[PDB]
Amino acid sequence: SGAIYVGNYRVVNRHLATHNDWANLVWEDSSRDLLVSSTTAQGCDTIARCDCQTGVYYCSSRRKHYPVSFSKPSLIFVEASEYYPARYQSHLMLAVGHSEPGDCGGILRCQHGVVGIVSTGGNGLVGFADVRDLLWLDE
Ligand SMILES: NC(=O)[C@H]1CCCN(C(=O)Cn2cc(Br)cc(Cl)c2=O)C1
Numbered sequence: 001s002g003a004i005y006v007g008n009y010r011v012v013n014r015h016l017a018t019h020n021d022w023a024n025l026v027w028e029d030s031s032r033d034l035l036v037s038s039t040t041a042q043g044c045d046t047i048a049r050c051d052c053q054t055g056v057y058y059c060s061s062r063r064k065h066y067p068v069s070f071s072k073p074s075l076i077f078v079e080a081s082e083y084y085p086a087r088y089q090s091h092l093m094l095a096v097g098h099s100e101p102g103d104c105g106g107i108l109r110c111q112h113g114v115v116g117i118v119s120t121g122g123n124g125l126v127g128f129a130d131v132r133d134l135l136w137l138d139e
């Protein structure tokens, strides 16, 4: 679980989106595991507008924040699930770190703000769905 609350938007993993998220749908991309929905309350999350490759992410499975080096957003293959078939997920950044089912939603942050959220993992790796390119979240 976990979400980014920026302005009048809520950003969540598309596979974890609720009925309210779908009822108040703004934008969704299956290939990125992102869903953005509208919220009546003003949220204060600063989105990073950078090309950082180091940051800190929150790991719910360890109740700890971890510093990580991560790759540039790219198209990386991800295996089937009760949510998605086997496909290439886009705008995904890999990092060496701990993650296990239940960690999706944990925010990855850098000095410039929110970079993205935990979307994939396993094998001593953690994958993050980038949100820095979504410029409309601030406007
Ligand atoms: N974005 C997706 O396709 C995910 C949908 C839910 C299932 N996906 C996963 O990666 C499940 N998972 C998540 C984390 Br975090 C760590 C591990 Cl070890 C793991 O197996 C894939």
Ligand SMILES: [Zn+2]
Binding pocket: 048, 049, 050, 051, 052, 110, 111, 112, 113
């Ligand atoms: Zn940054």
